[PDB]
């Protein structure tokens, strides 16, 4: 049976790594009773023999295949284990490390972390932004780079860089990507790239729209473009060996992840609902393309990847030749648990033809939940979406589309949304719902709800202020006012200028496209959901909407989770997440399936 606890039953795989004949990855479990994620590194032969590093993550297999570094968290500590016996030693006790990567010598690690002011009474800020979702307040944060010798166990080189810099090995050098500073740092837009060795550095690029993501010791793999006008442009990949060479210049899709392994580049593309795995070895070759999301991959002598589908969390695969499924962690649970395959439909919207999906429940007519993805350059299609399976099992149609602005299509399709949030993209959603209703006469047009997180939250607010179609909404971590998004959120300073418009203090678009200013129009009951550590869409986006809607006599409720960032629906504590799922299902049960007055959360939850 699907309910608010079902997500705790799945094994969650991440961070796959492979060297020689070995694969490692992390197995994570949500333990509802201790209220903790549990992490286990699993190392597999390729045999199917498994061994374990318990209470650990960040597996990094040494280039020589003889050992594995990993992190245990608590302060964090870096450990190194022999892969033969897995006997381990603690190497470095590390607060605030975000990455470790072996040097080609299988002796040194590069660790990138951060340092802040850390006064126990006040944060002090002189740069921007003051905070970032999932990181906290910056408090003057600088990036730190440590070269650690894992034999002697010492930091043998260290240097700092501006906030939000990154570093990868390039042979015995380090390629350092630093946000370019103009009036403010040009986050996500321009970087300066350096080559660093032994306390000295050479600037490789100045003010470019890509950063270094991998190296094979001869070539540097760069991610982005040489110059973007919009951060929303499709990120591409480039090889640099002295000359910068685009390897996908003729493919009008965005790269999701990429790695270089002896001059061959493995990479994934967002494509019409899927995230597909390709290889480039002079030409682009399809590796794993279908109705799925390749969530992660790694390549050395072998190529392994994590593939998630609409109805299964990610499992591990090995590519031959041919795809071979390596793991089946959830196979036994899913023998007993019904899932629902989405049905793809094309529909016309204004000038375009778009992708939609719906899931039909067993079935009278059935109520309908419309889901809107975040972004706007998010993408729905073929990954595992817990709420959708959950509500389909409870008797709802689920419908959702990729409006213009979505990832997975041409760059132009993504960029059509800019300065037009709530305009054509909302029409796309309404037109997809109209086509879905034509396809499915058993969908009850008189019981359609809408929900989404982030931009989907924005769109749920917007939908209730612009349309009388919806009977209920659940809007989460959303946007009701772009001006405060611009001035308050971690990314607003550059992101809103692009997506909403320039001259934000004068531009009328900031109120014209803001649900807050049309609150009077709202007629359907609404549940707002927010979390107190969300800095991507800060609390005022929900609480202002909630207060103004109350000031106008509207039926509205707000659940404010005391912990959690923007992605807390998926990343918050298991107990936190269970409570959100329960609220979510009960709001729709009691406001969409069959309207009931009030919403007594004490009685409803326990």
- Asked if 21 is part of the footprint of its own copies (rule: CB under 8 A), the reply reads no
By CB under 5 A, the residues from 54 to 93 that bind Mg ion are: 90
- Asked if 446 is part of the footprint of Mg ion (rule: CB under 5 A), the reply reads no
CB nearer to Mg ion: give 318 or 414.
414
Residues 6+ apart with CB under 8 A from 283: none
Minimum Å distance from CB 602 to its own copies? Answer: 6
- Asked if 86 is part of the footprint of its own copies (rule: CB under 8 A), the reply reads yes
- Asked if 582 is part of the footprint of its own copies (rule: CB under 8 A), the reply reads no
Cis bond before residue 513 (omega within 30° of 0): no
Among 1, 336, 351, 364, binds its own copies (CB under 8 A): 336
Stretch in the footprint of Mg ion (CB under 5 A) among 145-153, 156-164, 494-502, 586-594: 145-153
Question: DSSP class of residue 184?
Answer: S
Nearest to 402 by CA among 456, 366, 360, 450: 456
Name the helix (H) or strand (E) containing 592.
none
Minimum Å distance from CB 531 to its own copies? Answer: 8
Nearest to 402 by CA among 439, 477, 349: 349
The reply, when asked if residue 322 is annotated as ligand binding, is no
CB nearer to its own copies: give 279 or 601.
601
By CB under 5 A, the residues from 209 to 238 that bind Mg ion are: 235
Residue 597 contact, options its own copies, Mg ion, none, Cβ 5-8 Å cut-off depending on partner type: none
By CB under 5 A, the residues from 394 to 423 that bind Mg ion are: 412
Count the site residues for Mg ion by CB under 5 A: 4
Other C-beta atoms within 10 Å of 506: how many? 8
CB nearer to Mg ion: give 78 or 528.
78
By CB under 8 A, the residues from 472 to 511 that bind its own copies are: 481, 483-484, 487-488, 492-493, 505
Both ends of the chain: CA-CA distance in Å?
A: 19
CB nearer to its own copies: give 153 or 281.
153
Residues 6+ apart with CB under 8 A from 398: 340, 342, 358, 359, 368, 369, 371, 388, 391, 392
The reply, when asked if residue 118 is annotated as ligand binding, is yes
Q: Can you count the helices (H) and strands (E) in the chain?
A: 12, 37
Q: CA 72 to CA 470: how far, in whole Å?
A: 47
| Contact (CB, 8 A) for 486 and 492 | yes
Residue 423 contact, options Mg ion, its own copies, none, Cβ 5-8 Å cut-off depending on partner type: none
The reply, when asked if residue 38 is annotated as ligand binding, is yes
The reply, when asked if residue 353 is annotated as ligand binding, is no
Among 36, 245, 348, 563, binds its own copies (CB under 8 A): 563
> CA dist 501 to 239, 412, 508, Å?
33, 17, 9
- Asked if 544 is part of the footprint of its own copies (rule: CB under 8 A), the reply reads yes
- Asked if 594 is part of the footprint of its own copies (rule: CB under 8 A), the reply reads no
Residue 48 class from Cβ within 10 Å (0-12 exposed, 13-18 middle, 19+ buried)?
Answer: exposed
> CA dist 394 to 257, 336, 391, 605, Å?
35, 16, 5, 17
Enumerate binding residues for Mg ion (CB under 5 A): 90, 153, 235, 412
> Which positions make up the binding site for Mg(2+)?
38, 90, 118, 153, 235, 254, 412
């Amino acid at each position: 049976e699907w309910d608010e606890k079902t997500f705790t039953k799945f094994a969650y795989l991440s961070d796959p790594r492979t060297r020689k004949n070995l694969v490692a990855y992390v197995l994570t479990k949500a333990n509802l009773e201790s209220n903790k994620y549990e992490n286990t590194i699993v190392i597999e032969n390729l045999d199917g023999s498994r061994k374990f590093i318990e209470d650990a993550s960040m597996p990094r297999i040494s280039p020589d295949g003889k050992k594995i570094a990993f992190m245990r968290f608590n302060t964090a500590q870096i450990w190194v284990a022999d892969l033969k016996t897995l006997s381990a030693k603690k190497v470095l006790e590390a607060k605030n490390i975000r990455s470790i990567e072996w040097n080609q010598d299988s002796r040194r690690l590069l660790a990138v972390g951060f340092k802040r002011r850390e006064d126990e009474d006040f944060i002090f800020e002189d740069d921007v932004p003051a905070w970032f979702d999932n990181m906290g307040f910056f408090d003057g944060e600088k990036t730190t780079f440590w070269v650690i010798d894992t034999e002697g166990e010492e930091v043998i080189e260290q240097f700092e860089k501006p906030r939000f810099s990154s570093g990868i090995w390039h042979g015995d050098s380090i390629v350092v990507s630093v946000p370019h500073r103009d009036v403010i740092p040009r986050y996500f837009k321009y970087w300066d790239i350096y080559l660093w060795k032994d306390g000295e550095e050479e600037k490789l690029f100045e003010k470019v729209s890509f950063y270094a993501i991998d190296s094979d010791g001869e070539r540097i793999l760069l991610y982005g473009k040489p110059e973007k006008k919009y951060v929303s442009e499709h990120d591409k990949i480039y090889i640099y060996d002295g000359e910068v060479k685009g390897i996908l210049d003729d493919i009008d899709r965005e790269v999701a992840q990429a790695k270089i392994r002896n001059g061959k580049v493995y990479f994934t593309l967002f494509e019409e609902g899927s995230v597909n795995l390709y290889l480039w070895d002079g030409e682009v070759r399809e590796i794993a393309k279908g109705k799925h999301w390749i969530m992660g991959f790694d390549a050395d002598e072998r190529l392994i990847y994590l593939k998630e589908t609409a109805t299964r969390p990610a499992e591990l695969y090995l590519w031959d030749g041919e795809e071979r499924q390596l793991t089946d962690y959830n196979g036994l649970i899913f023998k007993k648990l019904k899932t629902f395959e989405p049905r793809h439909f094309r529909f016309k919207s204004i000038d375009l033809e778009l992708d939609g999906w719906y899931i039909k429940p067993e079935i009278e007519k059935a109520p309908v939940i419309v889901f809107v993805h975040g972004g706007p350059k998010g993408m729905y299609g073929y990954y595992f979406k817990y709420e959708m399976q959950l509500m389909a099992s409870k008797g709802y149609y689920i419908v959702y589309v990729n409006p213009r602005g979505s990832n997975g299509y041409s760059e132009d399709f993504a960029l059509r949304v800019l300065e037009r949030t709530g305009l054509e993209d909302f029409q796309d959603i309404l037109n997809g719902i109209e086509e879905f209703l034509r396809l499915e006469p058993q969908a009850d047009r008189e019981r359609i709800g809408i929900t989404g997180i982030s931009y989907g939250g924005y769109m749920t607010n917007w939908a209730l202020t612009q349309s009388d179609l919806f009977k209920a909404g659940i809007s989460e971590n959303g946007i009701s006012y772009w001006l405060t998004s611009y001035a308050f959120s971690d990314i607003g300073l550059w992101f809103d200028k692009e997506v909403i418009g320039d001259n934000p203090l004068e531009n009328e678009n900031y109120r014209k496209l803001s649900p807050l200013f049309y609150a009077k129009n709202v007629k359907a009951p609404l549940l707002l959901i927010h979390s107190l550590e969300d800095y991507r869409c800060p609390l005022d986006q929900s609480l202002m909407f909630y207060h103004v809607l109350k000031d106008l006599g509207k039926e509205v409720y707000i659940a404010i989770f005391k912990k959690g960032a923007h992605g807390h629906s998926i990343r918050g504590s298991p107990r936190h997440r269970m409570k959100r799922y329960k609220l979510f299902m009960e709001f729709f049960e009691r406001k969409l399936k069959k309207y009931e007055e009030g919403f007594d959360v004490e009685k409803i939850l326990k």
